[PDB]
Amino acid sequence: MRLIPLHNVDQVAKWSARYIVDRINQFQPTEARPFVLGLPTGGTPLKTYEALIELYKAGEVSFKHVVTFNMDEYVGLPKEHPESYHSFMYKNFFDHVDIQEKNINILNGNTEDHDAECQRYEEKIKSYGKIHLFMGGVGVDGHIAFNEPASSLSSRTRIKTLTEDTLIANSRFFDNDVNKVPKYALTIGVGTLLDAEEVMILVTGYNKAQALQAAVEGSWTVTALQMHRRAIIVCDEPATQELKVKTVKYFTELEASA
């Protein structure tokens, strides 16, 4: 596992966006051989998407032959609703880069069969082979996406009931009314994330300090990253408050070395 200890959220956004762009330009995707990218939502990914747009506007990268898969989506909320994950991804990223609609994949939470929709997504992932880079966040309790904190490492795409903690957090997006937050969501599994060639986790904020410590130092779903072949965690200084001094010191020198 690689830990990138940066100072602030802006540096985390710029570094993570630059890492994605560098890999896409190293890969050089085509119509026959696209670059497959897993994508999250939320406040911390939002700053990366803004930085990715800045690099696109600078002519530094093209998403024409980039295929994307998003982590999750609300059930029962129309995709046209402003607070859907479809709306988040288009409003904050897709509408500003040269991505192709047919290469965009976001789970549909309003199908005739939620179980069937989840398996279709898993098969669309397999049809491309593997995801080359899956970007994600972590929750305060170390949970990935909408998977339960204690999800099996083999878990796959499925429907989940939102916990009481996720409803009150996401309530700010729904007029500060917990009864307006969708009660269900479709979410990729932990096994779905680990099947990617690379996982990049963005961890910012004091409230994520225990999660980052569990991810980096502990033996908390995010701890499964320790057995992943190519795991990258990009954090800011407040997120490192629970790490040991020697841990931050070693990775701070390792990155300055590159």
Next chain:
Amino acid sequence: MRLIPLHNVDQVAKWSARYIVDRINQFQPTEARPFVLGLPTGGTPLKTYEALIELYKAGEVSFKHVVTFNMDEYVGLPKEHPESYHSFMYKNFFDHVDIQEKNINILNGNTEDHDAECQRYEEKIKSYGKIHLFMGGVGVDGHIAFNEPASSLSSRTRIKTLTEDTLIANSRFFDNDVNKVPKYALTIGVGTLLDAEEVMILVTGYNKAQALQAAVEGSINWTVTALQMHRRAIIVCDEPATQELKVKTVKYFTELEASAIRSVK
């Protein structure tokens, strides 16, 4: 508890020596009212003694009315032996400062009764009231002086067997022979150290990082964790000793003690 996170061993030596001198000059000791100082041995205390000698030669401090009590001493080893803690204290400190012979107190490991000698030592401490400042080190496993790892917090001065790990250590001082290291020592107890008004522990080196973590962050357990129940405990460390502490712990004490960090930077 205070943690003084400094950069290197020299700064730990200079700061700890300056702290001792400042307290002595703040105390203003006399014959009737002496300053009582507890003293350890070893490589890390040695640099503090060297720094204290420079401050004495500069006219910054006098030890004329300072009474000292050492932590421990080997049993069965003559005090004149080069590896006794008598020889360590005189060669590296007492022979270079203006301390008075009658104000020096070191456990005698060759008396006719080890229990009586230890009780006399405790009584001698009590006759002065309290030790005003007890300087000490810590072992890699958190032990203090020669107290066993699971020593009682109320334990007093007594004769003790050196642990197997203490026996393999210190073997370099006795011809690289574990069988030639003295098997017993007289040592102050954990309660004896805790009775002092103030305790200052010197913690340097990567090998002491686990010990510092137990002392500063761990729950009371590691004899050094007994410092957490003391009224005024001070730990002076260098950067390698902090490697096992949490970032927020070093961050907190670097800002809190920023004036003490700047004084030797």
